[PDB]
Design a protein around this ligand. Structure first.
Ligand SMILES: [Zn+2]
Ligand SMILES: [Zn+2]
Lengths: 651, 541, 661
């Protein structure tokens, strides 16, 4: 009977409430004027229809109770209407100058030809007679949505609003924008509530760059701006030096600006997840904000012909989930861009579902392994941001010019590797040194199987020096050489050829130190191979079915032996694992049926990230494109097909 | 080889069969001792008894809507019958057996399409490769039984062999489904797919069949047959007449009379092991774990009696009158409905004692725990007062030494007074000695105070020790009483749990496919569709 | 005011009729398992009145947790006894006793017989069976109270899978992640999580085939790992202290390289904190770097959390500093992982206030709140944690795919063991450099080897001048492997062999000493070798130097004027020699090129004038960007590693020659 704990009401603040939604049908009249027929077949840079589509996709899923698709007040049970109102001149003058306002006020009252002149002069903008009030409405809408979020009337808010505002600069407008929205809202909050909101975090994931908002808060330390976009300095809009990755603030607000540039288009989900999990979240947790604003934009979704990316609507949900985790829950999503209505509809639906309380769905492919450019880009970004922040020092080994006179006192190491190599070969296969006399070269340049003068089949393996994998100690900086491995790459072919009783000859060819391309190496390769053919191979009595295998470089020697001699009477196959180097061309002198013969019996395996396919001509001989990178991986993958081609070439 | 597994009824099927006996007893008694006739009456009697024995959801004269079948868990499905529980145990034993690489195949034989649909709904998601040899399948998957242009103008195409290292191959045992009707209408259905074991969900398969003789001929080893046997039923009698070593009406009547007589059969068996049994069955030996029961020995049974519930007190009208088909349906419907209301009310009244038992348990636990705390505190305080009694002993010793020294000085100076008094010549020694005796008396009073305080401290220590010695006995007594009550508490909890189960069973029966009228008769997902890899964990190819 | 202002007076037309919202998460409630019968199991106070400090596994735990909920309005049960009508935020799930089938799915029959027999033993029998097992106590009423947790866990998980709740909290005792399938241990009687997982996998093979079990309790989940070792349908990730024998349980099965077995290889993962005292930073780091990519790659259908709050702040058994916001953050991430399915079973916790607050925070996050803020987001996790996490990523890259080509491990294939045979294409680099050095030194000045017999070390470690026992003067270069200067590619890890620049700094001294006709002894202790995984460069160098001083050098007839030169951290091996032996009889000086490494604290064990003599007769060069009496005359060299060697060479050799006179 003893009532130990009397009943009470729950003590929470998040989710007894509803989600604020901001939308109005008066935001659909700022539109272009017809100039040429080309507008009918182009994505229409910023079109009104976007807005209503988003609204409709919500109504069809029950998150809104609206049968006739018009602005009502009884929005159901899961959301809450936030009414809009045109912003006063003071809220606008908080960011812009006083001549911009006069410019738009003049725009309000012009004639038709003057409007055309204005659209033609400006940096990719378009005006219209109804571009004053329809420009004032977004700022007031954003202000009211963020106000509602701060004063605790709702949990988090979403504002379907146009025209966008992350392109307009303080001086003048540019980029189909008229007034900046996010900057105006942030400044009026930070001046209105100096007790609860003292730091704000703006995030931009539209594929263009937000020069306007960045310039607004370039010299301020109360607003942290992070942006992800495509740079491509010359051509991709806006194409200036501000969007570059090295601009990290100026003045009292240094270190409070972050840019993340994709070096090439076509990035998908894995790149964004990697960038968010590696850069945005620790910086956000360290900055410790009190309100997170998102300048959303869906011109990077899968199925867009301007961004040309492949981001699926589940990555948006995952990012929204993390950003909801960041602050105490306050989150306002404003909407800026988009070019293909269906993709932005799906993406907006996903973001709305995650805002209501759902967990995000699963990605369609968790095995993607992002492009090699993005990883180097992210490392370069982490360097500067480690100079300025703290969550990037001591964890990525950063902590905040070799010589040119000591090159004569240098540990060789090349010979070293080969030396080691030779030893074990001998001690298990009894190889023999083959002398290339009248040539000054290291003695162990070519080793052959004992009694090579009696075998029918011969496999000639020409390769450069084997690779090295070096472990980088994580506590402080430099490479640790005492725990490195040597990836021998021409061992499996030797073993496979010795388990089927074939003659084996192995040729090593060094790399020229301090050279971009191993030019002298190619010359040494051609000389050694030509000599080895001229003085030894023509004289073995019992000979048939010779097969070459060139690993990496030093395949130029093989191609030169093919060209400057006639050897198709006995040899039957050439195989070359390029890796990443440039292709070697054939130059025939003896005949051209030799060139066609070379195109027929040949195999060349290259990386996926090679310079080509950005279709090679027949003077290279049937190149093929792997699905992985690196020498080791492509060898371990296509060793089977290579050895099958070899075995099929014989009887 | 033929085999038999003893299977019995459940409480739900027992009650439903009592309802049917209530509806069918009078005309049957009259017989043995377009409305209808006794022929169709006995026919519907036997058919409905068998249907109740096979998952009472078949009692309705309808078909399952073919959508809810793949939308209910295995627990709620097999909670109805016991045959389904035994068969599910068997299938689980055959699927998780110890395997090199064996692709052993089995066949499952039903009697009609209803039971076959129920089976295919039960064994849909499991790790098998299944093929329904009867028309109108349910989510047909396409398991087929056994029996790179790189350049222009070139031709290499190593792609094919490539896929021969990429395609994953299944290693799931084969399992086919069939019905005895379509098995007898046609032939050669089993001689194609070489099978090893047949599980007959029907117990009257008539073992010598053409479509099975061809199989016994073509096969190499001997094939075992497993018939699920109802422990007492109108088919077990005939099945026993076969186990050893016109007229169908009389056999029907004798079977039903035996069923009525043996409705209240006391003894049924248990303890069936499955792993050794499936091993014996697959290897082809005489299995001994199967039980040899084979029969049960032969006014007073024409009265239906349901299961007695605590404070229920209901009755059955016995329907001593004529009938008709629609009247039959409506009568059975309202009888099931009134029994449903009674069992609902029965559940909603045992809630009260559970509340009081929980409350008393909570209060008793809190009392025990407070008692333990008090024990610890009292022991700590006594441990603290120990060092103080020791120091008090030290002070008492000190005071006693001072006492001894003072009395010695008293005796000395008193002897000196005794010297100086006789023939006095009076010095001041007697004055000084008297002063010293006064000092001795003063410090004697002081030591007396101190020894009194020591004795008080000693008595306080002993009293606190006594209190701490009583507290433990109190705790032990409370523990004993707690255990004594805990026994019956657990009993009542288990009983009400079982009653909740039976109530949920009857509710789900009358909720879905339901008897012929609607007199009484999605979020939240109770029908197992929290969709995270359900449709895509169907094979969908 | 405005002019946009749609002025049309007509009735509009329906376009999208109203429907029920197509949402599958939070119109529902959260399940909560609780029953008052679980407070029955208790110890038997036997030795004396130890009532003051009770056993850490206490019934009140459940109570306290429950009570906290009733104080935050999440539950409207006043009498604190399990009722049905909890409230609008939760939904009570009934607890039933588990049968023999479900409990025999993983355990063996002998265990069931043992427990069901100890149900009705005498008193002294219970005392003996308590004192025999490894930290497990039995009592007369222990059967039903042990059958109840497994049933509760199965019921909660079934409610999650069928879709009657969103997630679930199973406030449940006794714990269940230390019981092996054949014996009890560690306060556990029946392994709850394994029983639950196996029954879900057996009774639901159409919505659940892969399950991810995460164990963030600070001890190791022995039983729950052993049950799913040979299985590839359950991925078991665990975070714990290891400490190899001191912490409980202290067995090899908890090491970081137990990465599976059979066909269940790569489906098990341990993350071991080396030293106790971790906090929020380490957990957030290990969750962002390891757990979440592996989870997203595995694609599970159900996520079970074998939670336990004995690592929270203010505790005594765990000794950590985890705060109630870290648990919220981890719960948030794990909610993100699957499509929302989540069961939280309670295992640990032995300080009522910490477990109360932590459980309150976890329940708040489960209900729908977002997590709170961390006390300090500038924490800089300890170095050993970073090194251990890197070592873990290496192995897990050899199995999983999300840990190579993003952490520069796509260069080599770690499935081949780094070895000297022809079985594997991989070979260690140290042997090659040492062989080249041996070749050069031998063919030039006849440098023989010195055998360190009865040790596990390569033969060519110590090289020496011939007839070293008759060399009237010995130089001893305890150097270290060189440092390279090349551009390490960041996608694969392979270095470009055309631009590498390596200098053998430890050779100039060997050349100089030969002209003076002094015997030379060169040592080369590598740095952890990547091969043994327990190699210590400090300990090994110490061993080699103690060996060389006790066995060989201490008996040479014509020995006099032995100098010492140290390069890199290996110089420490020199220090530990002088601080543990009286070596001042023949030794004259000691030189060190510390580079950027921190100083070496010399501590003696025999006398105390050693510090004075070491201060007088030492030269220790150091970096100019270092800024940092018993350290022995640190000098701030001008230039800078190799720079201070090439520049201060003359001063070092001049000082050595002067000290030799
Ligand atoms: Zn854009
Ligand atoms: Zn623990």
């Amino acid at each position: 009977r003893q009532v130990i704990v009397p009943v009470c009401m729950p003590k929470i603040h998040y989710s007894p409430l509803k989600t604020g939604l901001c939308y109005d049908v008066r935001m659909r009249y700022h539109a272009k004027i017809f100039t040429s027929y080309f507008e009918y077949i182009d994505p229409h840079p910023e079109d009104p229809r976007r807005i209503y589509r988003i609204y409709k996709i919500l109504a069809e899923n029950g998150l809104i109770n609206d049968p006739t698709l018009s602005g009502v007040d009884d929005l159901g049970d899961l959301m809450l209407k936030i009414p809009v109102r045109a912003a006063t001149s003071e809220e606008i003058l908080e960011v812009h100058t006083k001549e911009h306002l006069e410019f738009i006020e003049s725009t309000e009252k012009m004639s038709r030809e003057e409007l055309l002149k204005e659209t033609e002069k400006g940096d990719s903008v378009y005006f219209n007679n109804d571009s004053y009030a329809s420009a004032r409405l977004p700022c007031g809408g954003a202000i009211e949505a963020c106000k509602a979020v701060v004063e605790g009337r709702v949990k988090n808010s979403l504002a379907v609003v146009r025209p966008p505002g992350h392109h307009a600069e303080p001086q003048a407008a540019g980029g189909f924008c008229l007034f900046s929205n996010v900057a105006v809202a942030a400044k009026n909050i930070l001046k209105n509530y100096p007790e609860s909101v003292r730091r704000i975090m703006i995030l931009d994931w539209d594929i263009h760059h937000g020069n306007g908002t960045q310039k607004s808060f370039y010299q301020d330390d109360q607003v942290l701006y992070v942006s992800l976009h495509r740079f491509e300095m010359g051509k991709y809009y806006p194409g200036t030096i501000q969007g570059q990755y090295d601009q990290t603030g100026e003045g009292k607000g240094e270190g409070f600006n972050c840019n993340i540039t994709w070096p090439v288009g076509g990035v998908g989900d894995a790149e964004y997840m990697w960038a968010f999990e590696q850069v945005v979240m620790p910086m956000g947790r360290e900055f410790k904000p009190d309100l997170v604003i998102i300048s959303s934009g869906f011109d990077a979704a899968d199925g867009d012909t301007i961004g040309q990316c492949h981001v699926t609507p589940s990555c948006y949900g995952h990012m929204t989930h993390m950003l909801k985790s960041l602050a105490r829950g306050n989150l306002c999503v404003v909407l800026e861009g988009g070019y293909n209505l269906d993709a932005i509809a799906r993406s907006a639906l996903s973001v709305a579902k995650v805002l209501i309380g759902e967990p995000p769905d699963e990605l369609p492919d968790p095995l993607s392994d992002p492009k090699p450019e993005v990883i180097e880009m992210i490392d370069k970004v982490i360097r500067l941001q480690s100079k300025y922040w703290n969550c990037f020092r001591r964890r990525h080994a950063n902590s905040g010019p070799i010589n040119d006179s000591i090159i004569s006192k240098n540990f060789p190491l090349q010979k070293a590797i080969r030396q080691q190599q030779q030893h074990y070969l001998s001690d298990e296969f009894n190889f023999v040194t083959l002398p290339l006399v009248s040539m000054d070269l290291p003695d162990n340049t070519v080793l052959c199987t004992p009694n090579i003068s009696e075998s029918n089949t011969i496999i000639i393996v020409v390769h450069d020096t084997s690779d090295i994998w070096a472990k980088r100690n994580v506590i402080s900086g430099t490479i640790d050489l005492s725990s490195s491995v040597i990836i021998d790459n021409s061992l499996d072919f030797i073993k496979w050829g010795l388990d089927r009783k074939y003659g084996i000859i192995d040729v090593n060819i060094p790399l020229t130190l301090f050279e971009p391309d191993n030019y002298s190496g190619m010359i040494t390769s051609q000389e050694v191979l030509i000599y080895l053919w001229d003085n030894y191979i023509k004289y073995f009595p019992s000979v048939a079915k010779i097969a070459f295998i060139g690993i990496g470089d030093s395949y130029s020697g093989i191609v030169h032996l093919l060209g400057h001699r006639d050897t198709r009477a006995v040899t039957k196959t050439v195989i070359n694992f390029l890796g990443d180097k440039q292709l070697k061309p054939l130059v025939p002198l003896v005949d051209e049926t030799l060139s066609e013969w070379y195109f027929k019996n040949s195999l060349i395996f290259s990386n996926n990230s090679h310079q080509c396919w950005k279709k090679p001509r027949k003077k290279f001989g049937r190149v093929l494109r792997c699905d992985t990178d690196g020498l080791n991986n492509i060898i371990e993958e296509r060793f089977e097909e290579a050895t099958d081609f070899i075995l099929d070439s014989f009887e | 080889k033929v085999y038999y597994l003893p299977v019995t009824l459940t409480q739900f099927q027992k009650d439903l069969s009592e309802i049917l006996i209530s509806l069918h007893a009078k005309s049957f008694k009259a017989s043995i001792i377009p409305t209808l006739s006794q022929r169709q009456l006995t026919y519907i009697f036997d058919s409905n008894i068998r249907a109740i024995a096979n998952h009472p959801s078949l009692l309705v004269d309808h078909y399952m809507p073919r959508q809810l079948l793949r939308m209910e868990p295995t627990e709620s499905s097999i909670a109805g019958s016991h045959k389904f529980q035994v068969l599910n145990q068997l299938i689980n034993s055959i699927c998780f057996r110890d395997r090199p690489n064996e692709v052993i195949k089995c066949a499952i034989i039903a009697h009609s399409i209803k039971e076959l649909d129920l089976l295919e709904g039960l064994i849909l998601g499991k790790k098998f490769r299944t093929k329904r040899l009867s028309g109108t399948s349910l989510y047909n998957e396409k398991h087929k039984f056994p029996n790179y242009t790189g350049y222009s103008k070139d031709d290499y195409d190593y792609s094919v062999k490539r896929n021969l290292k990429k395609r994953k191959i299944n290693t799931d045992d084969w399992l086919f489904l069939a019905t005895t009707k379509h098995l007898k209408h046609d032939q050669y259905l089993l001689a194609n797919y070489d099978i090893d074991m047949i599980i007959s969900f029907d117990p009257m398969l008539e073992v010598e069949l053409p479509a099975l003789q061809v199989l016994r001929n073509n096969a190499n080893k001997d094939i075992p047959i497993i018939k699920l046997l109802v422990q007492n039923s109108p088919d077990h009698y005939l099945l026993d007449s076969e186990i050893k070593n016109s007229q169908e009406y009389e056999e029907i009547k004798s079977s039903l009379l035996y069923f009525l007589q043996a409705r209240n059969a006391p003894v049924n068996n248990c303890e069936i092991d499955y792993i050794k049994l499936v091993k014996c069955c697959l290897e082809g030996k005489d299995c001994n774990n199967i039980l040899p029961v084979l029969d049960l020995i032969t006014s007073g049974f024409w009265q239906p009696q349901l299961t007695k519930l605590q404070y229920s007190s209901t009755e059955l009208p016995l329907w001593d009158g004529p009938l008709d088909i629609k009247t039959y349906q409506t009568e059975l419907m309202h009888r099931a409905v009134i029994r449903l209301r009674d069992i609902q009310d029965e559940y909603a009244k045992g809630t009260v004692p559970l509340y009081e038992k929980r409350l008393n348990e909570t209060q008793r636990q809190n009392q025990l725990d407070e008692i333990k705390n008090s024990v610890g505190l009292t022991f700590k305080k006594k441990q603290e007062v120990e060092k103080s009694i020791n120091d008090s002993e030290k002070r008492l010793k000190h005071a006693m030494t001072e006492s001894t020294k003072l009395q010695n000085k008293i005796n000395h100076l008193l002897k000196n007074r005794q010297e100086l008094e006789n023939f006095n010549k009076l010095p001041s020694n007697t004055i000084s000695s008297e002063n010293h005796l006064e000092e001795g008396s003063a410090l004697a009073d002081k030591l007396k105070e101190y020894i009194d305080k020591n004795a008080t401290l000693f008595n306080k220590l002993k009293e606190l020790q006594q209190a701490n010695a009583e507290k433990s006995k109190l705790n032990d007594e409370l523990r004993s009483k707690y255990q004594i009550e805990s026994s019956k508490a657990a009993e009542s909890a288990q009983t009400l749990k079982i009653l909740q189960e039976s109530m949920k069973s009857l509710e789900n029966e009358v909720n879905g496919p339901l008897t012929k009228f609607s007199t009484e008769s999605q979020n939240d997902f109770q029908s197992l569709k929290a969709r995270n890899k359900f449709l895509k964990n169907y094979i969908t190819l």
